[PDB]
């Protein structure tokens, strides 16, 4: 099925629990699609900025899965401000910030922080993260789950 089809099912607010079947289905689809990466980020950005917390949370988990399954061609898309700004808006009071839960915000910060280490190649991700700290959105670097593949 289509990219949106997979994601809609992988981020459905009604899901009683995460459905890794669809999460993986979404990733495999992107790896097949000529424009899967470009379409995928825009689709994910939107789901992540959703007022429904469970939808946004699931979207973040799907985003995490994509980074580990969709290789370099996905990383390049996530590494552009065009997508990065969408995440900033989620944690910045000037935008969605004051209407988004902490769980969602910290997850975003965690992922962003994680990427600055994992993707030293994507310089735009670092600038995005520093800008956050500089503006006081991120007081200190947060602790993160142990993953020895994060180089």
């Amino acid at each position: 099925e289509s990219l949106e089809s997979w994601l809609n099912k992988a981020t459905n607010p009604s899901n009683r629990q995460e459905d890794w079947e669809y999460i993986i289905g979404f990733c495999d689809q992107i790896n097949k699609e000529l424009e899967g990466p470009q379409i995928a980020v825009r689709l994910l950005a939107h789901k992540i900025q959703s007022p429904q917390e469970w939808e946004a949370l699931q979207a973040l988990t799907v985003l995490e899965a994509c980074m580990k399954n969709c290789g370099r061609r996905f990383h390049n898309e996530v590494g552009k401000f065009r997508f990065l700004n969408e995440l900033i808006k989620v944690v910045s009071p000037k935008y969605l910030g004051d209407r988004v839960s902490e769980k969602v915000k910290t997850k975003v910060i965690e992922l962003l922080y994680s990427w600055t280490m994992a993707l030293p190649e994507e310089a735009k991700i670092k600038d995005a993260y520093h800008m956050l700290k500089r503006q006081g959105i991120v007081q200190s670097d947060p602790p993160i789950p142990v993953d020895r593949t994060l180089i």
């Binding site: 552009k80 401000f81 065009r82 990065l84 700004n85 900033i88 808006k89 910045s92 009071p93 000037k94 935008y95 735009k124 600038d127 995005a128 800008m131 503006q135 959105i137």
Partner: peptide, 8 residues
């Protein structure tokens, strides 16, 4: 091709 870093 890309946008500029958003500013708060």
């Amino acid at each position: 091709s890309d946008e500029d870093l958003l500013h708060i």
